Every structure is written in structure tokens, then in C-alpha cells.
């Protein structure tokens with residue numbers, strides 16, 4: 532039984548696990564702790580890129596953004612290198628999704644603009660998609676640090692899956708912008724050991740990960756069967772029992788995804 536398997540994984544990893552797969556043509560929704568809040572961590576970068584794409588003409592991708600030494604405040608594998616040159620909006624989107632670059636995401640939040648360095652506008656974008664649950668309150672590095680249970684900087688597996696479904700499968704974005712987001716997630720470099728590890732190689736997987744303090748490890752994905760039937764998969768986890776420095780455990784997500792894949796096969 533799925534719920535039993537998910538509970539077994541929680542015990543194995545001393546973790547809290549949340550899973551949501553929306554209902555489809557012939558499958559019921561899969562849900563486990565799906566309405567409990569979990570920190571977004573870097574998963575917010577996927578709808579962030581959607582918001583920036585939606586907000587602007589496509590060629591806003593070519594706008595060069597400049598920044599400085601004091602802007603590097605978080606893991607930023609790509610932006611660390613381009614302080615002098617600056618990065619285009621398209622480069623920032625690419626880095627935010629594919630390398631989970633924190634500076635890139637902070638700069639995208641500032642591009643979106645408005646109160647809270649862009650976090651209010653980000654939240655407003657989610658509200659426009661019918662998500663009355665999620666909230667972003669801080670940028671990097673703070674957004675990954677809220678104590679377990681705190682509602683700041685949280686979503687739920689259910690909420691984020693419905694958002695991702697609209698962005699990738701539905702009509703939240705026009706086809707050209709939708710393809711940009713989809714391709715960046717398809718080319719993600721950080722997800723090999725999470726949802727991807729749970730699905731057979733002949734399933735397509737696109738995803739965006741997040742990792743945070745208190746053992747936080749998330750992954751949100753869209754997967755397509757070998758015959759092109761898509762499913763949205765959100766898996767979220769934390770390990771409050773280990774305190775702030777608890778190690779995130781990717782294997783928990785790989786195992787959860789393997790269980791989901793077994794049901795969807």
C-alpha cells in the first residue's frame with residue numbers, strides 16, 4: 532500500500548514526506564501529507580521564471596543585468612562568474628532553473644519588482660493561478676532557513692503541483708514561453724538523484740529541485756510516459772528531528788518517486 536510505503540520511508544529517513552500527483556484521465560490523485568506546508572526552498576524558481584516570462588516580451592530575455600560582489604550571498608554556480616560582465620535575463624533564467632543559482636533568482640525577483648524585493652509580486656503571480664496557499668516572504672539565502680512549522684516561504688505538495696501543471700501542461704503561459712520553461716527544466720542539472728531516479732529511462736522527466744536547512748529536500752517534476760501521457764509529481768521532505776544542520780536525504784525522494792512510478796506504470 533502507498534500510504535504504508537510512504538510512512539515506511541518517513542521512519543527510514545527520520546523525515547516528514549509530502550507527495551502529490553494530480554488526478555488524470557484514469558488515475559486518482561496520489562496524496563500523502565499533500566496539504567501540509569513545506570518550505571519551497573529553490574522550487575520557487577520554476578514559477579519565478581514563469582512569472583518573469585509572462586510579465587515581459589520574449590526579447591526581455593536579451594536584457595543585460597548588472598550586479599556586484601555584495602550580491603553574491605548564496606550558492607550561485609553561474610552568477611559567481613559574471614559579476615563584471617553581467618548576465619542577460621535569459622542567462623539568469625537558465626542558471627536559476629538548471630543550476631539553482633541563488634543570485635540569479637534574487638536578480639529575477641528584483642526584475643519582477645515591487646515590495647519585498649519581488650517576493651510580493653511572486654506571490655501575486657501564484658494567486659493569479661488560483662494558488663491561495665503558497666507564500667514567498669524572503670529571498671536567498673533566508674528563504675531556506677525558516678524553522679520547521681513556520682509558514683513563511685512555504686507551499687504544499689498539492690499547491691505547487693497544481694501550479695506546475697498549469698505552467699507546463701496548461702495555458703498559464705503562451706506556447707513560446709511555455710517551451711522556454713519546459714526546456715530549462717528538461718535540461719536541469721541538479722535532479723538526477725531525485726524524481727528522475729524513480730522513473731524508468733524511457734519516461735521523460737523535467738524538474739526543479741530545492742534543498743534547505745532542517746534536512747529539506749524537494750523536487751517538482753512533470754513526467755511523460757513512453758506514450759506521451761503526462762503526470763505532475765511533487766515530492767517534499769524535511770527532517771526536523773536533526774535540527775538546523777540535518778542532512779537532506781535525496782534517496783528519500785528517489786524512493787518516493789519509485790513508488791509513485793510503480794503506480795503510474
Ligand SMILES: *C(=O)[C@@H](NC(=O)[C@H](N)c1ccccc1)[C@@H]1N[C@@H](C(=O)O)C(C)(C)S1
Nearest residue numbers: 572573574606630631675721740741742743
Ligand atoms: C535551493 O533550494 C538552493 N538551496 C540552497 O542554497 C541551500 N542553502 C543548500 C542546501 C544544501 C546544499 C547546498 C545549498 C539551491 N537549490 C538546491 C537544489 O536545487 O537542490 C542546491 C543544493 C542545488 S542549491
